[PDB]
Amino acid sequence: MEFTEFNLNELIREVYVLFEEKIRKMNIDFCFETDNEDLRVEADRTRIKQVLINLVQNAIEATGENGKIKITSEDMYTKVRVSVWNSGPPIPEELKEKIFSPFFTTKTQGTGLGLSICRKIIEDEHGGKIWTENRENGVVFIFEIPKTPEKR
Ligand code: EMC
Ligand code: EMC
Known part of the structure; x- marks a missing residue:
């Protein structure tokens, strides 16, 4: 991996x-907010991009037509936090960790959830954490990564 x-x-x-x-085609209300416009990290950009693409793809599928997605990025002490929320039904408590298993596959609309690889990227490759919670009539996926591999 290549950290930059x-x-x-x-x-x-x-x-x-x-x-x-x-x-836009799906008529989804999208918003992105940050608490620091110049939020910089040292990480593998390609890999972090893969996690973001996977979370946004899942948010769109989950919220469907006329849905809502909000992304936030937050500057924390030794880390950053990115939260991707969608309006939709809550994740049942029994499935919250199971969705991150390489063998969760009770998921279609044509595509697997990809979350085991997101976890590998966030937790194994970057020493961060990724989880989900139910909030505000929807679901959020949150990841945190150290601002540098040295703050791991
Ligand atoms: C109402 C979706 Hg930022
Ligand atoms: C499908 C890579 Hg999180």
Whole structure:
């Protein structure tokens, strides 16, 4: 893996641009907010991009037509936190960790959830944490990564 310094918000916007047409076609209300425009991390940009694409794809599928997605990025002491929320039904308590298993596959609309690989990227490769919670009439997926491999 290749760690480089990059603006995390720039990467989030790059991923939004990938989905902009689909989001609009589906009439989804999307918003992105940050608490620090110059939020920079040292991480593997390609791999973090893969996690973002996977979470946004899942948010769109989950929220469906006329849905809502909100992304936030937050600058924490030795880490950053990215939260991707969608309006939709809550994840049942028994499935919260099972969705991250390489052998969760009770999921279609044509595609697997990809979350075991997201976990590998966030937790194994970057020493962070990724989890889900139910909130505000929807579901959030949150990841945190150390700002540098040295703050792991
Ligand atoms: C109402 C979706 Hg930022
Ligand atoms: C499908 C890579 Hg999180």
